[PDB]
Amino acid sequence: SLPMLQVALDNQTMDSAYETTRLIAEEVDIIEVGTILCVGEGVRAVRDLKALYPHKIVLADAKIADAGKILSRMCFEANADWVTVICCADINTAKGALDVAKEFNGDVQIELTGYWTWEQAQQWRDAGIGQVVYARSRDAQAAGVAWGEADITAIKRLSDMGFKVTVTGGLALEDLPLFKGIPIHVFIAGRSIRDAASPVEAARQFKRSIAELW
Amino acid sequence: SLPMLQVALDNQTMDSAYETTRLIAEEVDIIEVGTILCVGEGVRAVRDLKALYPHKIVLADAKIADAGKILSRMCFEANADWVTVICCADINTAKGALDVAKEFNGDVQIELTGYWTWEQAQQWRDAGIGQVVYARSRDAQAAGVAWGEADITAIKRLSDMGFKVTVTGGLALEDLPLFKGIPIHVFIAGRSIRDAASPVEAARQFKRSIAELWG
Ligand SMILES: O=P(O)(O)OC[C@H](O)[C@@H](O)C(O)NO
Numbered sequence: 001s002l003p004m005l006q007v008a009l010d011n012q013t014m015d016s017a018y019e020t021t022r023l024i025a026e027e028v029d030i031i032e033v034g035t036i037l038c039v040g041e042g043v044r045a046v047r048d049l050k051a052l053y054p055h056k057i058v059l060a061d062a063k064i065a066d067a068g069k070i071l072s073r074m075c076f077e078a079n080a081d082w083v084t085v086i087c088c089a090d091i092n093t094a095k096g097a098l099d100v101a102k103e104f105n106g107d108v109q110i111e112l113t114g115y116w117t118w119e120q121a122q123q124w125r126d127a128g129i130g131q132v133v134y135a136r137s138r139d140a141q142a143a144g145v146a147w148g149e150a151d152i153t154a155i156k157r158l159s160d161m162g163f164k165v166t167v168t169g170g171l172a173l174e175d176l177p178l179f180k181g182i183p184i185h186v187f188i189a190g191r192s193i194r195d196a197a198s199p200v201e202a203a204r205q206f207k208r209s210i211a212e213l214w
Numbered sequence: 215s216l217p218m219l220q221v222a223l224d225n226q227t228m229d230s231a232y233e234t235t236r237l238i239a240e241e242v243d244i245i246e247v248g249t250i251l252c253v254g255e256g257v258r259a260v261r262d263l264k265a266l267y268p269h270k271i272v273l274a275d276a277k278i279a280d281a282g283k284i285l286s287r288m289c290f291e292a293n294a295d296w297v298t299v300i301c302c303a304d305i306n307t308a309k310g311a312l313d314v315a316k317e318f319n320g321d322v323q324i325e326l327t328g329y330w331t332w333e334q335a336q337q338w339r340d341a342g343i344g345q346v347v348y349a350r351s352r353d354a355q356a357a358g359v360a361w362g363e364a365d366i367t368a369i370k371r372l373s374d375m376g377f378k379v380t381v382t383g384g385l386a387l388e389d390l391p392l393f394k395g396i397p398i399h400v401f402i403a404g405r406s407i408r409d410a411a412s413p414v415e416a417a418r419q420f421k422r423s424i425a426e427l428w429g
């Protein structure tokens with residue numbers, strides 16, 4: 001399988017998000033309700049986006065930290081396909097969210113941003129979690145933290161544990177060759193698509209490069 | 215000084231939250247916009263609740279995990295006084311949220327969960343963070359995790375490091391004596407107030423017990 005392409009709608013309001021979706025919804029595989037849009041608009045953003053694009057996978061990037069069953073159910077009742085749980089959530093939070101995902105035939109991803117451990121990685125695996133998002137923090141990036149070999153070896157290690165790995169966090173087109181040879185499940189782009197002079201070209205170039213590399 | 219009482223509005227809609235606030239707004243110190251309510255309604259929950267109760271401290275329990283400046287600014291533009299940042303956030307995320315908080319004369323709390331370390335705690339202090347929320351996860355609680363010895367020791371050590379400590383996570387009235395003798399800044403009660411037969415009397419019982427235990 002080729003890595004899928006996900007657009008992150010890190011917008012504060014629906015109308016701002018639609019400025020992007022009206023250009024590129026058909027140019028990507030997955031539409032993400034970004035955490036910024038989850039907090040700006042609430043779960044209506046999931047419901048509205050899935051009604052607009054029912055044939056796309058909709059990911060609610062809620063970064064659930066507790067109340068796994070409650071928050072997941074809210075997102076799944078709004079018709080999310082997938083939801084995120086932040087890495088430092090209690091293991092029972094992740095388990096809870098996953099139990100609810102299964103009722104809706106959806107899925108849970110653990111968002112790996114900031115501090116987490118390899119022991120937690122094993123715990124998620126034993127809990128039946130099959131997806132992680134290897135996600136360089138926007139704020140770490142802004143402080144000058146680049147992608148590096150340690151990221152590549154961590155991603156390969158996660159893949160080898162049986163996770164379908166998503167790669168994200170200020171990704172630019174030119175970053176993609178860093179990950180060649182790894183069976184990446186999804187690459188996410190937010191800013192590099194939404195804020196490009198031509199969002200359509202930016203999305204197609206991502207897809208082109210992925211097809212060439214994989 | 216008496217521990218203050220915070221009500222957690224973990225409601226999915228505003229009207230459900232108001233069924234509680236109309237009863238207990240004046241019976242508590244801090245009004246928390248629960249994570250559940252932030253995700254249910256979005257940041258308008260902060261704006262609306264502050265407009266109803268402008269004289270109270272309003273906490274947006276956003277549990278910010280990244281994009282500290284952006285999310286914190288959304289909450290503070292909605293007139294929040296305090297915001298939460300989840301403890302595994304990159305340190306620059308915590309710093310970013312605090313930078314924006316100071317611009318609004320507000321504050322940030324680090325919300326404790328997972329496998330945080332004492333060196334990370336020192337980082338938060340060094341970054342200028344003065345509040346932490348020592349929380350038992352709802353889901354841990356449902357799996358049978360109880361308050362106990364290790365919690366008391368950790369809370370005391372956080373206080374000695376200079377943090378004001380909030381304690382929370384399925385607190386019932388009978389849990390308060392466990393923390394006697396520790397200078398707790400805030401106790402949060404969500405379910406134990408919202409779901410009581412009489413929310414007003416539940417809140418007052420918490421206040422009476424605190425006044426006795428810390429008096
Ligand atoms: O490509 P970006 O602008 O960094 O956005 C994608 C990223 O995954 C964000 O949505 C995010 O969740 N950051 O924490």
Ligand SMILES: O=P(O)(O)OC[C@H](O)[C@@H](O)C(O)NO
Nearest residue numbers: 066222382383384403404405
């Ligand atoms: O007393 P509760 O129903 O547990 O609610 C308070 C708690 O702090 C929640 O608001 C929360 O943030 N749980 O993670």
Ligand SMILES: [Mg+2]
Nearest residue numbers: 008034035061
């Ligand atoms: Mg995101």
Ligand SMILES: [Mg+2]
Nearest residue numbers: 222248249275
């Ligand atoms: Mg809360």
